[PDB]
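[SOLVED] Predicted holo structure with calcium ion

Edit: marking solved, answer below. Original request kept for reference. I posted the sequence and ligand SMILES and asked for the 3D complex as structure tokens.
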Amino acid sequence: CNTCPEKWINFQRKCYYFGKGTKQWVHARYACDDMEGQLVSIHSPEEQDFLTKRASHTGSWIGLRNLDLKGEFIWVDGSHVDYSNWAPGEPTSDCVMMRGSGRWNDAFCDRKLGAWVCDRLATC
Ligand SMILES: [Ca+2]
């Protein structure tokens, strides 16, 4: 399965949308939902590398958040963290962003970032 909607990019069995324009995290979450995807989940180094190659230099929202501040970071699709790419010292805790390096930072959810990444399953 490697088919994606127009404007989305395939990697492996998924499709990705590199969104641009100011969003706080929840607004990015809904922006992805409006296009029938979700804020991206990341489950391998190879997926991460694909994303880093396209990462906004001024940071991007991804689909990880410290749910109900129950203290566990969980992906928006409900999957759990098995792969991680935290920047040194992170998480400091919120909502998670990807730096230009691809590394992750937990941040205030009301922070305004210029980019955000969505995913969905590729069709076959
Ligand atoms: Ca942090």
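OP edit: Helices lie at 25-34, 45-52. Thanks to everyone who chimed in.
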